[PDB]
């Protein structure tokens, strides 16, 4: 993996993070408070990094050499550099919302949220427990343990070939689609944390990639790195077409689905389905007249097989 | 409309707003954090005004002359002056809760919430899009467009005569009741935003004023400019009379209804009905034993016609 994490690199990273903070306090950006909110995320990430350092008082050599922590720190440093490049190389299109540069800052925001979530899953309370992480579906737990043991983080290639023995991937293009879905921190590493998220979202394990095919790859309602405010904004054009709906990953309850939909009374509501898989929510909502037109489209996929 | 908005007037307004802030940090007031909270509202309003100015860097002449923005700024300035008068001309009855002066500060609070909401609807992201605002019910959309085109804001008189051609108003007293309901920012102007709120609340459009007659004008459960904390406080006297209920506009989800009710287990709960109009919620809740005694009264209106 990347290099060992010393004090010099943590104090560089914070200085990068504080630069992204200053950039992001531009009033022309019109940043709204809702998650994911980069103005809370960077400060919160520093705080959890303070926590880790504090509990590794003495044992810095152990922490500095930890594999996950080295990959994490590199991801964090790379992403905060991408955000600084994005502002600089975007000059004034950062301010026109629905410019590409601006969509790119929202996507980073989400990535900064997914990274903080992963770091807290792996280091709850500032201490490394990647090696005892609990994978939430038992079959998926068995897969990881048989393939990688108690490893916290594995390169994409090695993950893809392990997955491929049990759940065959059809092609190069399907594999790249798969990668973008799972690899929430976008760093070409698959964590036990990102694996947990993906197999909870696309359970049951016994048909994993067919489930991911129907709900994401071939479904017009699925929306990849979208936020709550983006879903609301996207549905506005269908305000007069009750039953229009889209769905995505929840950013604050990672592992759970969030469905957005236009009601018959002129509201745009967002829900998080409980005690039922997305399929069943989608089927029943169609049957009850709520989830009819995915992304405002007139046909809806028949998930009833 | 009012005068053009220059730098001198924005810096006056902020100075007024900061005076209301200082007044409102009196510990004798016992202000609670819940929405609507004047201590978050004024600061937030400044922030969105910072945002607007920032995106009109250069084009101040365009912004300064915008019709809605001129009316807004006047409303904001008038209301912050009323609040300063209220403290000064209230001397020490501001501190006795359930004094009139104190109820008047709560009502202003709500008004400051409704204004901020209108300003964000009309200037989402700091840019003026009153002219493309989406009215949420299609019929109501047609009405506005046929009557006023793409105007953002119209004087009450002109609004009343337009409404009156399609939905006849019975009398002067009914017209004044109507005005107080719709005119959420209390400035004798009806925005496309306030119109949207009113027709979402009292839909369907085809019986608009009968709907507003049954649910507000003649219903003992309707409560005009009340907050969540006021509803809770008002229901306390009926704590031992399960089924007592009141309803009002939600302040944080403008356009939606919030029902307050005393349960059979000694709780006071507040709900926001979804995928059904207030009528249906009221009828079904009566039939299921939840919403029985409006404002603790023994008879309940029969909405089942």
């Amino acid at each position: 993996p990347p290099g060992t994490v010393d004090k010099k690199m943590v104090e560089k990273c914070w200085k990068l993070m504080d630069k992204v903070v200053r950039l992001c306090q531009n009033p022309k950006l019109a940043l709204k408070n809702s998650p994911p909110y980069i103005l809370d995320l960077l400060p919160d990430t520093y705080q959890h990094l303070r926590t880790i350092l504090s509990r590794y008082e003495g044992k810095m050599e152990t922490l500095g050499e930890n594999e996950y922590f080295r990959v994490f720190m590199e991801n964090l440093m790379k992403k905060t550099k991408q955000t600084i490049s994005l502002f600089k190389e975007g000059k004034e299109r950062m301010y026109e919302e629905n410019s590409q540069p601006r969509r790119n800052l929202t996507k980073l925001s989400l990535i900064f949220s997914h990274m903080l979530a992963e770091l807290k899953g792996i280091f709850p309370s500032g201490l490394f427990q990647g090696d005892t992480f609990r994978i939430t579906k038992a079959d998926a737990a068995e897969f990881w343990r048989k393939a990688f043991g108690e490893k916290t983080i594995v390169p994409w290639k090695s993950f893809r070939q392990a997955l491929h023995e049990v759940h065959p991937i059809s092609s190069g293009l399907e594999a790249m689609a798969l990668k973008s879905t799972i690899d929430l921190t976008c760093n070409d590493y698959i964590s036990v944390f990102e694996f947990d998220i993906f197999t909870r979202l696309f359970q049951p394990w016994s048909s994993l990639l067919r489930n991911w095919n129907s709900l994401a790859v071939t479904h017009p309602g699925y929306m990849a790195f979208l936020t709550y405010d983006e879903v609301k904004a996207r549905l506005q054009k269908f305000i007069h077409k009750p039953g229009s709906y889209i769905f995505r990953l929840s950013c604050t309850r990672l592992g759970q689905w969030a469905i957005g939909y236009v009601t018959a009374d002129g509201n745009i509501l967002q829900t998080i389905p409980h005690n039922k898989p997305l399929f069943q929510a989608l089927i029943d909502g169609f049957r009850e007249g709520f989830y009819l037109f995915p992304d405002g489209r007139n046909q809806n996929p028949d998930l009833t097989g | 409309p009012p005068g053009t908005v220059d730098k001198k007037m924005v810096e006056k307004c902020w100075k007024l707003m900061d005076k209301v802030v200082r007044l409102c940090q009196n510990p004798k007031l016992a202000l609670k954090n819940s929405p609507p909270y004047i201590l978050d509202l004024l600061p937030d309003t400044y922030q969105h005004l910072r945002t607007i100015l920032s995106r009109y860097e250069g084009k101040m002449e365009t912004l300064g002359e915008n019709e809605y923005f001129r009316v807004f700024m006047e409303n904001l300035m008038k209301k912050t002056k009323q609040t300063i008068s209220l403290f000064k001309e209230g001397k020490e009855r501001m501190y006795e809760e359930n004094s009139q002066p104190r109820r008047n500060l709560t009502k202003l609070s709500l008004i400051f919430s409704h204004m901020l909401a209108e300003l964000k609807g009309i200037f989402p992201s700091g840019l003026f899009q009153g002219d493309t605002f989406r009215i949420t019910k299609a019929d109501a959309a047609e009405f506005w467009r046929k009557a006023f085109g793409e105007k953002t804001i119209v004087p009450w008189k002109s609004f009343r005569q337009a409404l009156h051609e399609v939905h006849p108003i019975s009398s002067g007293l009914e017209a004044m009741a109507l005005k107080s309901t719709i005119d959420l920012t209390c400035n004798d102007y009806i925005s496309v935003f306030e119109f949207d709120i009113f027709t979402r609340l009292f839909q369907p459009w085809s019986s608009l004023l009968r709907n507003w007659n049954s649910l507000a004008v003649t219903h003992p459960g309707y409560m005009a400019f009340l907050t969540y904390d006021e509803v809770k406080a008002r229901l306390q006297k009926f704590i031992h009379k399960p089924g007592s209920y009141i309803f009002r506009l939600s302040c944080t989800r403008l356009g939606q209804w919030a029902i307050g009710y005393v349960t059979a287990d000694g709780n006071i709960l507040q709900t926001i009905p979804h995928n059904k109009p207030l009528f249906q919620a009221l009828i079904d809740g009566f039939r299921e034993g939840f919403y029985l005694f409006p404002d603790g009264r023994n008879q309940n209106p029969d909405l089942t016609g």
């Binding site: 809702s34 969030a258 967002q270 829900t271 998080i272 929510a281 709520f290 | 979804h274 995928n275 059904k276």
Partner: peptide, 9 residues
């Protein structure tokens, strides 16, 4: 935090 409401009616 954002507004998530109960599944539809």
């Amino acid at each position: 935090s954002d507004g998530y409401t109960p599944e539809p009616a």
